[PDB]
Design a protein around this ligand. Structure first.
Ligand SMILES: [Zn+2]
Length: 356
């Protein structure tokens, strides 16, 4: 009745795999066509798809009508400038003059404008959809932000397109003490990953700032998650790390759905639960600590960690330690206290929100 209740939840989540894989092929077709149009613009010359996120991390449990798409764009010779003491928000400057780089049209005086660039990006996708008489793909006129472009394929699939800059540079100094995988995935692996580029997605806190993004590293360490190189590659090594992340994601989803009226949980996201999960992985580096037989025990440790972040109002970004995702400024004290009472109730009543 214990971990077997959770096993039955995970079995129910497999039924939606065929509907999610069908709808992912719908999005890929649309996104691949938009990528060809974006490649025609000399500003979006180096544009490419970044195959990161829940679907590619094999943790896309539910919401077959909701997808998130990422688009990279190589920005060579970059110059960063930390916005205030927000260790994740930066200003994008250029190491060499405007004639050299093609993004020069979006420069708002030595500083790249995220609003000037996202408006061009939106304008291209909009005219591409308008030119094509297909009544299936429709762009929704949103409030702003990033993903600033949100599409609706076949009047059902909502897609969230995000634009990101790729910097093949050394990661910013704010990430110096982040990614604590040395005793789990190894010091060799941490060195290897830190040589890979980092991304910058437009996000305010000055409106012309960009937040650091490591969606690729998150995918890389989720699909190679064990200390043993052969983890989940055979019957004797099937761990429950991904099952736990799936269950934490589903716990937040169902709680958000249950309280979609008194909206306290709308500030919470599947990224908060993913970030907390990576911290639980750092606390439990052995594959012994993630046995398939101990699913109940492992999921309970994931819930307890998340409860501690809500109670202490502290959830560090896995890559930028000084960036507190649960800071009083990003999420208020009352929303965190409300979620704490709901997770405490769920944990105490054998999780009724999962049940049929
Ligand atoms: Zn494994």
């Amino acid at each position: 009745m214990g971990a077997s209740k959770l096993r039955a939840v995970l079995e129910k989540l497999k039924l939606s795999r065929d509907d999610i894989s069908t709808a992912a092929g719908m999005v890929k077709g649309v996104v691949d066509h938009l990528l060809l149009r974006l490649k025609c613009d000399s500003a979006f010359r180096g544009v490419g798809l970044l195959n990161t996120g829940s679907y590619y991390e094999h943790v896309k449990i539910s919401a077959p009508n909701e997808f998130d798409v990422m688009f990279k764009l190589e920005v060579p010779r970059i110059q960063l400038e930390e916005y205030s003491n927000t260790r994740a928000y930066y200003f994008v400057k250029f190491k060499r003059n405007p004639k050299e780089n093609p993004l020069s049209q979006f420069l708002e005086g030595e500083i790249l404008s995220a609003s000037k660039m996202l408006s061009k990006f939106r304008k291209i996708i909009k005219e591409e959809i308008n030119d094509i008489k297909d009544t299936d793909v429709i762009m929704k006129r949103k409030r702003g932000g990033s993903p600033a472009v949100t599409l609706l394929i076949s009047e059902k699939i909502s897609v969230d397109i995000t634009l990101a800059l790729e910097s093949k540079s050394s990661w910013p100094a704010s990430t110096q003490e982040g990614l604590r995988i040395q005793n789990w995935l190894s010091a060799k692996v941490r060195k290897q990953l830190r040589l890979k580029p980092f991304y910058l997605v437009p996000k305010h806190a000055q409106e012309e700032t960009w937040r650091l993004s490591f969606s690729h590293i998150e995918k890389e360490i989720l699909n190679n998650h064990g200390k043993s190189k052969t983890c989940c590659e055979n019957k004797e090594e099937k761990c429950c790390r991904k099952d736990c992340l799936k269950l934490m994601k589903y716990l937040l989803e169902q709680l958000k759905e249950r309280f979609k009226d008194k909206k306290h949980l709308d500030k919470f996201s599947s990224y908060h639960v993913k970030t907390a999960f990576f911290h639980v992985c750092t606390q439990n580096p052995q594959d012994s600590q993630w046995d398939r037989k101990d699913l109940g025990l492992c999921f309970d440790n994931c819930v307890t960690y998340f409860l501690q972040c809500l109670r202490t109002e502290k959830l560090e970004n896995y890559f930028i330690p000084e960036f507190n995702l649960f800071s009083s400024n990003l999420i208020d004290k009352r929303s965190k206290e409300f979620l704490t009472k709901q997770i405490e109730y769920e944990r105490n009543n054998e999780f009724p929100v999962f049940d049929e």
